[PDB]
Amino acid sequence: STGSATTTPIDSLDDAYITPVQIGTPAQTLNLDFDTGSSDLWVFSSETTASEVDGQTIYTPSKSTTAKLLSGATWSISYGDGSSSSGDVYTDTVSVGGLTVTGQAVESAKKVSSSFTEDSTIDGLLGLAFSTLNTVSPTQQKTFFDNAKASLDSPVFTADLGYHAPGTYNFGFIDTTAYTGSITYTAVSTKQGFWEWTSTGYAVGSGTFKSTSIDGIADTGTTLLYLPATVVSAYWAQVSGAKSSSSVGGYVFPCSATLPSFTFGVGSARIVIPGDYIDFGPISTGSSSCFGGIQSSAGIGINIFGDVALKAAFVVFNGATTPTLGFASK
Numbered sequence: 001s002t003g004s005a006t007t008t009p010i011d012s013l014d015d016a017y018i019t020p021v022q023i024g025t026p027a028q029t030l031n032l033d034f035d036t037g038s039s040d041l042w043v044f045s046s047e048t049t050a051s052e053v054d055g056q057t058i059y060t061p062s063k064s065t066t067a068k069l070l071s072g073a074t075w076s077i078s079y080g081d082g083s084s085s086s087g088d089v090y091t092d093t094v095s096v097g098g099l100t101v102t103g104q105a106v107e108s109a110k111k112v113s114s115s116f117t118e119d120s121t122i123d124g125l126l127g128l129a130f131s132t133l134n135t136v137s138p139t140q141q142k143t144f145f146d147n148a149k150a151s152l153d154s155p156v157f158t159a160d161l162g163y164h165a166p167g168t169y170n171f172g173f174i175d176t177t178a179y180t181g182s183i184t185y186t187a188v189s190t191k192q193g194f195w196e197w198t199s200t201g202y203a204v205g206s207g208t209f210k211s212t213s214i215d216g217i218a219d220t221g222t223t224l225l226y227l228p229a230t231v232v233s234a235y236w237a238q239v240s241g242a243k244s245s246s247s248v249g250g251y252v253f254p255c256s257a258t259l260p261s262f263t264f265g266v267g268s269a270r271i272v273i274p275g276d277y278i279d280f281g282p283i284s285t286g287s288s289s290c291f292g293g294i295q296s297s298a299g300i301g302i303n304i305f306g307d308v309a310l311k312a313a314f315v316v317f318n319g320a321t322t323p324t325l326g327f328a329s330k
């Protein structure tokens with residue numbers, strides 16, 4: 001089998017991407033944030049505290065003939081930005097872009113934190129990290145990918161995120177028309193449950209490439225590119241007026257600037273992030289201070305190749321017995 005689904009930015013800044021997912025019988029279509037940095041498929045639901053739902057589409061398990069309560073199972077997750085959600089668990093049929101999994105754990109939110117409530121465009125998350133991170137208790141559950149993979153033509157999925165435009169998640173095949181040149185594969189560590197890999201270095205704009213190992217995760221569920229403070233300082237030093245603002249919470253730069261590109265290494269290959277990808281617009285409406293798309297990971301504990309980096313590439317998440325990541329230009 002295979003699946004193919006379009007993923008769409010939720011706003012003009014590509015703050016996140018939503019992908020339609022069919023849940024239940026008859027189908028209930030929810031727009032989920034495919035997140036290669038977490039491993040829970042959870043949804044706004046008929047069980048979500050009413051005051052915490054504001055415009056989201058909800059899953060109603062009582063209306064699905066294939067929904068079964070997973071007796072005794074609960075879940076609770078906290079994310080890197082301090083947001084969170086928790087609830088109970090059903091199994092049900094879940095389909096993504098024509099690819100169907102039966103008995104998928106669908107984690108029904110009873111509570112969500114304010115940032116989820118405040119985002120009317122995201123109906124839940126679909127985790128695509130390794131199932132060892134899944135938070136369901138007392139019986140940990142598998143991701144959609146983990147459940148689908150035996151059935152897939154090839155045990156892979158690919159992320160092809162657009163810049164200010166729709167893109168594609170494919171399951172089970174590599175679309176050789178979707179990238180240029182060749183795909184460079186690189187080793188993955190699953191020890192932390194992430195698609196963790198080691199970049200071979202970076203360049204700023206037309207600058208010389210710095211060979212240096214940067215260990216980080218490929219995370220479609222994180223908006224920005226978070227890298228060591230040395231790297232991030234070298235980038236923003238090339239932007240007149242750029243500075244790190246403690247009050248804003250990161251690097252800001254004059255909205256009048258033209259940003260340099262940022263290159264990262266994948267083995268001997270190079271992925272170039274155009275400067276425009278690094279502009280996340282005014283810090284507040286009407287401000288001429290703009291928020292940077294490359295930020296320090298110093299306060300995080302891990303480097304994160306988020307959407308800013310991934311959207312510059314065609315990315316293969318290879319879930320073979322020894323997982324690897326592939327990157328191609330596009």
Ligand SMILES: Cc1cc(CN)n(C)n1
Pocket residue numbers: 016033035037038079080081083122125221222
């Ligand atoms: C919308 C969204 C996605 C995620 C997962 N990194 N969070 C914390 N919020």
